[PDB]
Each structure stands twice: as C-alpha cells, then as structure tokens.
Amino acid sequence: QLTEEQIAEFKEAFSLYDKDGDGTITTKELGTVMRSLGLNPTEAELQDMINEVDADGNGTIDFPEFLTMMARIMK
Ligand SMILES: [Ca+2]
Numbered sequence: 001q002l003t004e005e006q007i008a009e010f011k012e013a014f015s016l017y018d019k020d021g022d023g024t025i026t027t028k029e030l031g032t033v034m035r036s037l038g039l040n041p042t043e044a045e046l047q048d049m050i051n052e053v054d055a056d057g058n059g060t061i062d063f064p065e066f067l068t069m070m071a072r073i074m075k
C-alpha cells in the first residue's frame, strides 16, 4: 500500500526539481539539476528529455510524470 512517508519523499524530490514552487518542471529547472550532477546539456537535449515522459503533451513535467521518471530509475 501507499504510505504518507513515501508520498513525503516523492514530494521532496519533486520540490528539489521544482525550485520556484509553481507545480511544473521547466527546461531551466531540469538544466540546473543536470549541471549540478556534472553534465552540460543544451536546451534542446533538455527538451528531448521532457518529451520522453510528457504524457499530456503540454511540454513540461508535472507530478505524475515525475513519478514515472522515478519508477524507471529505481526499477
Ligand atoms: Ca516550476
């Protein structure tokens, strides 16, 4: 079953990406995190990364889409 602690961790990770707190993840926020890992992606490469998990086609990552990303990293 889903727990409130699990929910809490998910929310922490999302917020680590969503810096301005508006509930969506932009190419610029993605960029910030990827550069902190030691990579140097172009704007278009960041957009290709969004395009992989963008299930509603709106061009940015929301919470359930982020959940998909984590699903793939852990599993
Ligand atoms: Ca945001």
Ligand SMILES: [Ca+2]
Pocket: 054, 055, 056, 057, 058, 059, 060, 061, 062, 065
């Ligand atoms: Ca989306």
